[PDB]
Amino acid sequence: MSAQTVSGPTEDQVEILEYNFNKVNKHPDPTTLCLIAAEAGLTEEQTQKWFKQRLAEWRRSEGLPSECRSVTD
């Protein structure tokens, strides 16, 4: 029962998404989202919602001062 992508993507999708995240450019992209979403078996909405959540974790783990090279003192 409820064997569908209700509310958010399923585990199987996270597998394709994680690969995509590590292969695209580590950033939510417009052209990229639509194209990769279709191949992942999702839509932009779902891909955006997922990619953005990893964005926060990415910044924590890799330690990035925002986007550009700026020394946070």
Residue 72 CB partners (closer than 8 Å, separation 6+) = 65, 66
Contact, 9 vs 46, CB < 8 A?
yes
Q: How was this structure determined?
A: NMR
- Cα dihedral sign, 64-68-71-72: negative
DSSP 66: S
Q: CA torsion sign, 53 to 54 to 56 to 60?
A: positive
Q: Which domains does the chain have, with CATH numbers?
A: 10-63 (1.10.10.60)
Closest CA to 8 of 39, 49, 36: 49
In angstroms, rounded to a whole number, what is the distance separating the alpha carbons of residues 4 and 12? 11
Cα(48)–Cα(37) distance, rounded to whole angstroms? 9
Evaluate whether 10 touches 18 at the Cβ level (below 8 Å). Answer: no
